[PDB]
């Protein structure tokens, strides 16, 4: 780290009116009560009403930026139809340097922390001047908060129990 902090790239309030946002799960929990990760969001329909999205951001802060997102892989289809109302997955998280799309399916798995389902997590750095776009037909995890930073040099990582 030379600089590192947390800001609110897309505030949960007013980012996603047209998708119901507040849904969470019970493994991600706090003192025996359900939750989900602070920095991110789920999105789903407005009473089973999915429109598909295009959104973007580019830097004004003039510092480097660190961004995270995810891609939904349900363990069953009834969720997928019920939430998002497409068997089609097509997402496109795009930049100048980086760009990648996603089109997954159901893929059943064993219970792991009482979960079969999966969300594969995906991330990138994003510099000043460059723009990012998200496009999607659902099956997303979005940024609520994002990590502002400068670079650092020479510090690192330890494993230790002492």
């Amino acid at each position, epitope marked *: 780290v030379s600089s590192f902090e947390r800001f609110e790239i897309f505030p949960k309030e007013s980012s996603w009116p047209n998708h119901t946002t*507040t*849904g*969470v*799960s*019970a*493994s991600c929990s706090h003192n*025996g*009560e*359900s*939750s*989900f990760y602070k920095n991110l969001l*789920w999105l*789903t*329909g*407005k*009473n*089973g*009403l999915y429109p598909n999205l295009s959104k973007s951001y580019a830097n004004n802060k003039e510092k480097e930026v660190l961004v995270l997102w995810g891609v939904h892989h349900p*363990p069953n289809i*009834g*969720d997928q139809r*019920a939430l998002y109302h497409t068997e089609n997955a097509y997402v496109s998280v795009v930049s100048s340097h980086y760009s990648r799309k996603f089109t997954p399916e159901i893929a059943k798995r064993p*219970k792991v922390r*009482d*979960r*079969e*389902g999966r969300i594969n997590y995906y991330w990138t750095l994003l510099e000043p001047g460059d723009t990012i776009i998200f496009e999607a037909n659902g099956n997303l995890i979005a940024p609520r908060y994002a990590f502002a930073l400068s670079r650092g040099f020479g510090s690192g990582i330890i494993n230790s129990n002492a």
Partner: single-chain antibody
Framework: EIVLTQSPGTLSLSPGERATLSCRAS???????LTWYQQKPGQAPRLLIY???SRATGIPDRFSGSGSGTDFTLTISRLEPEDFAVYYC??????????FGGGTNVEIKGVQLVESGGGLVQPGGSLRLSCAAS????????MHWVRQAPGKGLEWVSG???????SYSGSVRGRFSISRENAKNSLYLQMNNLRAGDTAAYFC?????????????????????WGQGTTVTVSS
């Protein structure tokens, strides 16, 4: 959340007949948003229909509806004297507040919960209820406490998502207080400052699969299942 208005609160019709019922509100309100019930007095509610179209488990095909926005509608293909009953209209606010149509009698002319503690208190006093869970994962679902006077339109007292966003009514709030336990498989409702508006029957109610877990458990934005309720009264 918004005032509903059923249509009619009571009707009288003959065998071999349809029955149109229209529950409509102030504003236009998105249509996978309501669910539709029946009750035999003496019995708890039973679930029938949701989202203005679609049909619950263990069923005929006769109760069927339509409608959208401001006006939601449940129609009926055939009437029978076993259907003698009051049908209800329960909608999940976006202000996360259930609202209730006031029951609709059909007259025909010629796994489980368990509540705990219903009974008497003094008015202005203090008492608690609980519910306890049997045979599922009380982790997941969004829960609701509900009220019902005898042979009257319902009212919704309280509910809470599994993250902690409460919803009460502005009149009921503060005098009651909810609190939840998943490891213990039970729910709690400490209640104080109690007047004759509470002179009625109550229910503990299990609603919505939040987003995710393992199971053979899909979701609606209707209920899952109910409890047998219990009576509560202030009296001196």
């Amino acid at each position: 959340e918004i005032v509903l208005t059923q249509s009619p609160g009571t009707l009288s019709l003959s065998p071999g007949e349809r029955a149109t019922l229209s529950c409509r509100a102030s504003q236009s309100i998105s249509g996978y948003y309501l669910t539709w019930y029946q009750q035999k007095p003496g019995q708890a509610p039973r679930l029938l229909i949701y989202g203005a179209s679609s049909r619950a488990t263990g069923i005929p095909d006769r109760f069927s509806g339509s409608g959208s926005g401001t006006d939601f509608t449940l129609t009926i293909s055939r009437l029978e004297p076993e259907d003698f009953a009051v049908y209800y209209c329960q909608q999940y606010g976006i202000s996360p507040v259930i609202t209730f149509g006031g029951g609709t009698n059909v007259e025909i002319k010629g796994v489980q919960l368990v509540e705990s503690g219903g009974g008497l208190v003094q008015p202005g006093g203090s008492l608690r209820l609980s519910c306890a869970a049997s045979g599922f994962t009380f982790n997941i679902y969004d829960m609701h406490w509900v009220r019902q006077a005898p042979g009257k339109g319902l009212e919704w007292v309280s509910g809470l998502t599994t993250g902690g966003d409460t919803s009460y009514s502005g009149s009921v709030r503060g005098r009651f207080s909810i609190s939840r336990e998943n490891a213990k498989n039970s729910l709690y409702l400490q209640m104080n400052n109690l007047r004759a508006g509470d002179t009625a029957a109550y229910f503990c109610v299990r609603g919505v699969r939040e987003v995710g877990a393992t199971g053979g458990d899909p979701f609606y934005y209707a209920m899952a299942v109910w409890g047998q309720g219990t009576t509560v009264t202030v009296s001196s």
